[PDB]
Amino acid sequence: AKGVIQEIIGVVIRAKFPEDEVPEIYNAIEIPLGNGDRLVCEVQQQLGNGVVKAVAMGSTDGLRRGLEVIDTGRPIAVPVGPATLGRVFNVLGDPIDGMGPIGPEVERRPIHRDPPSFEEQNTQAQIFETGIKVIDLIAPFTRGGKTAIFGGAGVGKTVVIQELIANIAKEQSGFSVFAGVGERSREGNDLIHEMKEARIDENTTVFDKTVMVFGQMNEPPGARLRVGLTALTMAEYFRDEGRDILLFIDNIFRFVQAGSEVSSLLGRMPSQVGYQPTLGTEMGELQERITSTKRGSITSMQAVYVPADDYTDPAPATVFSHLDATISLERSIAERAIFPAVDPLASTSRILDPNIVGEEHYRVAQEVKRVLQRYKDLKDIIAILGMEELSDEDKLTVQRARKIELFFSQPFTVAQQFTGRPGKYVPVKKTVESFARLLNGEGDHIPESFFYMQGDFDDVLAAYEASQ
Amino acid sequence: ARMVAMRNATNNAKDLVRDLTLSFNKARQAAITKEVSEIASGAA
Amino acid sequence: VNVGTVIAVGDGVARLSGLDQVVASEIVEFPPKAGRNESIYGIALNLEQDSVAAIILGDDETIEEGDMVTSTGRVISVPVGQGLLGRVVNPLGQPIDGKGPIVYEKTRPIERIAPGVITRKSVDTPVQTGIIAIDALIPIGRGQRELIIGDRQTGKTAVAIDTILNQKGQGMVCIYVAIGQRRAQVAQVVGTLERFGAMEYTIVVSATASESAALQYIAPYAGCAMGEEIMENGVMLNGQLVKDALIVYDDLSKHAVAYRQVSLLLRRPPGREAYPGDVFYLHSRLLERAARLNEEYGGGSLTALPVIETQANDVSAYIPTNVISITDGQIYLESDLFNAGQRPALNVGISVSRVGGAAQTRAMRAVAGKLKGELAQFRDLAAFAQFASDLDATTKAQIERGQRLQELLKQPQYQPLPVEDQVAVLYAATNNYLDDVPVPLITKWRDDFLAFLRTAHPEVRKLIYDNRLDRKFPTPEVKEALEAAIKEFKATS
Amino acid sequence: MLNGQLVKDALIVYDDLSKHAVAYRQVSLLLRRPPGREAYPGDVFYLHSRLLERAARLNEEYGGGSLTALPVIETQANDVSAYIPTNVISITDGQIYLESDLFNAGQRPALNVGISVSRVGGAAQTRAMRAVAGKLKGELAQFRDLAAFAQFASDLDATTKAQIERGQRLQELLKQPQYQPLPVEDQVAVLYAATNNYLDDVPVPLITKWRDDFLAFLRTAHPEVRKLIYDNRLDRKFPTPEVKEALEAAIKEFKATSN
Numbered sequence A: 001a002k003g004v005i006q007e008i009i010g011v012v013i014r015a016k017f018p019e020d021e022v023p024e025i026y027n028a029i030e031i032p033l034g035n036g037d038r039l040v041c042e043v044q045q046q047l048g049n050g051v052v053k054a055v056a057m058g059s060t061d062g063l064r065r066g067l068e069v070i071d072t073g074r075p076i077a078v079p080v081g082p083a084t085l086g087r088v089f090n091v092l093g094d095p096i097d098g099m100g101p102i103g104p105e106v107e108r109r110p111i112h113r114d115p116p117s118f119e120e121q122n123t124q125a126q127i128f129e130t131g132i133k134v135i136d137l138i139a140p141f142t143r144g145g146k147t148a149i150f151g152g153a154g155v156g157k158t159v160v161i162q163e164l165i166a167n168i169a170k171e172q173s174g175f176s177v178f179a180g181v182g183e184r185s186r187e188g189n190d191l192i193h194e195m196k197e198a199r200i201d202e203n204t205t206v207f208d209k210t211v212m213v214f215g216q217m218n219e220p221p222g223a224r225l226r227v228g229l230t231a232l233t234m235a236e237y238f239r240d241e242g243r244d245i246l247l248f249i250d251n252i253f254r255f256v257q258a259g260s261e262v263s264s265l266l267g268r269m270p271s272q273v274g275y276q277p278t279l280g281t282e283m284g285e286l287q288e289r290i291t292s293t294k295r296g297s298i299t300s301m302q303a304v305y306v307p308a309d310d311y312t313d314p315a316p317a318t319v320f321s322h323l324d325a326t327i328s329l330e331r332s333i334a335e336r337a338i339f340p341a342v343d344p345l346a347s348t349s350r351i352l353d354p355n356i357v358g359e360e361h362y363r364v365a366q367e368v369k370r371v372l373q374r375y376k377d378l379k380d381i382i383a384i385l386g387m388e389e390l391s392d393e394d395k396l397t398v399q400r401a402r403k404i405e406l407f408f409s410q411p412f413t414v415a416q417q418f419t420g421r422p423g424k425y426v427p428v429k430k431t432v433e434s435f436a437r438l439l440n441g442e443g444d445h446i447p448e449s450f451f452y453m454q455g456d457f458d459d460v461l462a463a464y465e466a467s468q
Numbered sequence B: 001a002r003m004v005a006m007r008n009a010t011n012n013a014k015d016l017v018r019d020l021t022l023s024f025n026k027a028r029q030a031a032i033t034k035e036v037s038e039i040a041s042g043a044a
Numbered sequence C: 001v002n003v004g005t006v007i008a009v010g011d012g013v014a015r016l017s018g019l020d021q022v023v024a025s026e027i028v029e030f031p032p033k034a035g036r037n038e039s040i041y042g043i044a045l046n047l048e049q050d051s052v053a054a055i056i057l058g059d060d061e062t063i064e065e066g067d068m069v070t071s072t073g074r075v076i077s078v079p080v081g082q083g084l085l086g087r088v089v090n091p092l093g094q095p096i097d098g099k100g101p102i103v104y105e106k107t108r109p110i111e112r113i114a115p116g117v118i119t120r121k122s123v124d125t126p127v128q129t130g131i132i133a134i135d136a137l138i139p140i141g142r143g144q145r146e147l148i149i150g151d152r153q154t155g156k157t158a159v160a161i162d163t164i165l166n167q168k169g170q171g172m173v174c175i176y177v178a179i180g181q182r183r184a185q186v187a188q189v190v191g192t193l194e195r196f197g198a199m200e201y202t203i204v205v206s207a208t209a210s211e212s213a214a215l216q217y218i219a220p221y222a223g224c225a226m227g228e229e230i231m232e233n234g235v236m237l238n239g240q241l242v243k244d245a246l247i248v249y250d251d252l253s254k255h256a257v258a259y260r261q262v263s264l265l266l267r268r269p270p271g272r273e274a275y276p277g278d279v280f281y282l283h284s285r286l287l288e289r290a291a292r293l294n295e296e297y298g299g300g301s302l303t304a305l306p307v308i309e310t311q312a313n314d315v316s317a318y319i320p321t322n323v324i325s326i327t328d329g330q331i332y333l334e335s336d337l338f339n340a341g342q343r344p345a346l347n348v349g350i351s352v353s354r355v356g357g358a359a360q361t362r363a364m365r366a367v368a369g370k371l372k373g374e375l376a377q378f379r380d381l382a383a384f385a386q387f388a389s390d391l392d393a394t395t396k397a398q399i400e401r402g403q404r405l406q407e408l409l410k411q412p413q414y415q416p417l418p419v420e421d422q423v424a425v426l427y428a429a430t431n432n433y434l435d436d437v438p439v440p441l442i443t444k445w446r447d448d449f450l451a452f453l454r455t456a457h458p459e460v461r462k463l464i465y466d467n468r469l470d471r472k473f474p475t476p477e478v479k480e481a482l483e484a485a486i487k488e489f490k491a492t493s
Numbered sequence D: 001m002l003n004g005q006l007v008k009d010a011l012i013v014y015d016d017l018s019k020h021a022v023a024y025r026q027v028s029l030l031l032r033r034p035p036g037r038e039a040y041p042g043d044v045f046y047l048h049s050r051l052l053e054r055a056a057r058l059n060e061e062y063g064g065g066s067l068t069a070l071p072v073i074e075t076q077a078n079d080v081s082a083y084i085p086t087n088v089i090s091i092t093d094g095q096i097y098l099e100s101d102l103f104n105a106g107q108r109p110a111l112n113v114g115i116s117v118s119r120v121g122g123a124a125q126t127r128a129m130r131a132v133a134g135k136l137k138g139e140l141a142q143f144r145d146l147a148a149f150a151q152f153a154s155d156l157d158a159t160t161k162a163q164i165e166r167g168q169r170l171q172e173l174l175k176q177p178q179y180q181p182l183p184v185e186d187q188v189a190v191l192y193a194a195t196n197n198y199l200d201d202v203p204v205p206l207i208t209k210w211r212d213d214f215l216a217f218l219r220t221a222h223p224e225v226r227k228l229i230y231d232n233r234l235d236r237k238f239p240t241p242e243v244k245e246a247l248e249a250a251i252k253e254f255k256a257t258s259n
């Protein structure tokens, strides 16, 4: 304990400790910083004669060299238990809501814990109904399994996440944890607060069953780097005692970007496009903790931001192998005013198996993909020549594909703020029936424009009758 | 009718070439950036 | 301990050996010497052992090896207050207009963490840009981050200037931050602001292309610190205290380019498109400070209007997508529409404002919802517009109406429209009251209608302005009054 | 010791060598070794060559054992010309390309048979399989060639129409479900039935059901034909009149009974 700061490079602080009291790899050291409030750094490396390199996870832009640092001797500890329910925390576990601090009697758990072993893994999963046609048909939201949506900058990842929460957080049958590792403090939070506090479950709000840890974009790289681990530690307590947990981590890519900035400041050799050499290991350490085990189940739902529109970027490429259900949002689909913007061809799921989701559901999904696969094959032919050169069956499949593409669009109850269309909740059975009817041939006479932003097939038929 | 269809097809083909050339140029620059990054990193 | 000596001057970075007890972002002084009457400052960033790398905020040819440096004891800060109003200043806060020294009682440090999550509230108070298309289809609220993204010469600067001009009586403190813009453009912008009298409430921070890459990198943070001071403490405008501010960052692409130059001259590893890996953090920590604080934290706001320049309308680049992800909405200014004559070129099909739709005057939304619907129908019918005499009455009428609405959206530069005039014009357009007016004369029809309402019927405008907040705007009184006004105008015309 | 028999054959599947290359890149960069192409270390081809050249079929003097390797590589956006994919393509003796376009189009194994190659070739097939699959490969290749005319032209002669139909028959034959492997005798029987025009009258959408029913037929009605096919699958001339009969008879009986 009682070291001194040697260098302050960005948010990376190199401190010198006595020879026999060097902090451990992941210990949390503190600068008094004056004013009675301290800056909690996390060690990352040990460089030699008592010299350690720590990540500030704070402003670290008003402190000098030679400042003393106090070694706590333990990694970052965050409160866990029912006391964390309905509260908002930092990466450090310090509450930021108007309510008081967590009492000392509440257990503090280190945010760096080993992921569940191979024995503890629970492979049992089943479809989690969500009411979104494209999600519940092509890439079923998996209960007890990791799933994530990959979108660019203009697509509505946040809208989809908010609608999903509105649909499924009321009938939770358990607590939930939200972690915006990297997201706008406007819509990622302080507006999800209003939505969650407005929703009421038998005189108890949804927010009364939720633990929320942000580390918003504004925060320095350390907070965005470790906020995911804080949320995971807060949710593992509830998973370990059997409670079903809904976990919503927003923009894992921001966690990766924070890791990249920290690594760049740490002097590590860059890999690929400026990313950290330890990208795969960091992703493994975070993601392998998001697992439903034999003691409890975590129904994770993540979001991933692709830089520019590159799906070959190392961060989404690393995420892709850590998921059960993959949802891909495309810029072109969104620019075609299809707000869900999900690409069925590039979106898959593990539980899209007839033994799990249902034989009819599986057949319908496979046909809805074989169509639009024919369409992707004939895209160039249509673009340069036109519909006429195709054969009759090819033509029919093409307009069926366009009708399906239009029909995947669905109004969202959270889209009322900029769209006047009321939201719709289409059950998975209704979605399967509607798409089976559409593929049978029913609805062929209906023009494609009638499938835009509708509910089930009955709503499309009713609109067609209204317009005669 | 064939003359109209071919004229539309040629216009669509020329528009596609302009779009592809626009996309090829972006891929050409990104290839240069990638090389100028590995060589500079390999230098240090 | 407050003094040190430069030991190496290189790619815009000095080494400043022996300057300990310097804070991690202190603004070092470089006191003047022979040949340099003024002092050029620097930001000490890499506080490594026995060396303090410092970014030279200015031309690096001024200093040599052995120059004395004195640490000022302050984290990098910009002077801020009521004295900044109506002044064009450097990113450091020094004035460049030559009017006189800047008067200020307190300084606000740039490069600070945004207020947070709990310290925020959903936007409710609208921002009137004065453009029909923007104010009717892409509502902007106070504290919203709306991005103006276009392709070079398309009108992003013009849109920002119109928005600044329209905030004359709205109790807003406009801030225009010019990053990387050539001095001619900045001078023309300042002159345009002066001519229309908007310079009395507008603070302009200029970091031009010739300036060092250290500037154009702190300029948006200087402007954001000014906006934060306006948002939290507030200033007296027109005899009233205003805590609402609007800031236009102008070209954030040039800001990202300047930060890339600074990083590469510091030998930091490049990332995608040679930009440093923390460019997203750069723009996020810049834009996240533009917030709409709740009442218990003062109730202030700070609207941000970043401007992003694209190449060949490539919205899927690195910096444009980064800024799109940071901001709340987009205003896509297409080049094809701009060249076609639609000078307020907006890609309404893809431009959107996620927040602020509920932060709009009830009259404007109540008249513009069906406007947006009809524009959507026209865009849907754009494919069928090629066919001649093959369309029924409904489709032909829809195409004609869409053309009329687009021509109405065409608004000449430097002519903001008050909210009452905008809502009256849209109510006239959307009630089949302009179907008889030929398309090429709709602009002059709108101009004549506005002149008539300014001269003949000020009471109608005042009543609309007073009754724009009602839940049901089309009350019988305003409806009959405006219908009588338009019938009189049509009879006279 | 496996099932009471001394097994000296091993089959190793590297679940993903791209992740292994990523791990080696991480450990090299953390050791501050100089990078190479795409930040991978210089000797990544040496890495994977060391790993893969240990898979061999030793001669009888050295034990006669073997080790079969199936490296697995994911490609970003089907970029075969990347660094690790090209390295391991150079190292291996064969490639099996799986495409998302074929996978979505209903072709479940999703093999791109046009570009998937096996340098060992017929030497790694049973004599029955080698004798039956040559016509399969030729007809499938010619169908792939004629797909250009099939996509557009509708005035093609009856020969080309029937040949496209046969190509579709074979492609639908290859559409295998998951966790349902077919033993060598079953595949030989099905391919002999398909390549000898016994399947021409079956419509394309029902060919998979036809194959499943035919396999149920052989497994229940005529186990002896399967035993006979498997018994003499190594002879130089597999289609002997003996194997030729009682197999065409089984196909004819199945065709007559159902549909």
Ligand SMILES: Nc1ncnc2c1ncn2[C@@H]1O[C@H](COP(=O)(O)OP(=O)(O)OP(=O)(O)O)[C@@H](O)[C@H]1O
Binding pocket: C150, C151, C152, C153, C154, C155, C156, C157, C158, C159, C185, C343, C344, C411, C412, C413
């Ligand atoms: N609404 C408008 N009506 C008429 N002309 C306009 C309008 N908006 C912009 N222009 C003209 O377009 C040109 C460029 O406009 P502006 O100065 O806003 O540039 P920009 O597109 O924002 O970008 P840049 O700063 O790169 O030139 C000028 O000649 C300006 O007069």
Ligand SMILES: [Mg+2]
Binding pocket: C152, C153, C155, C156, C157, C158
């Ligand atoms: Mg401009």
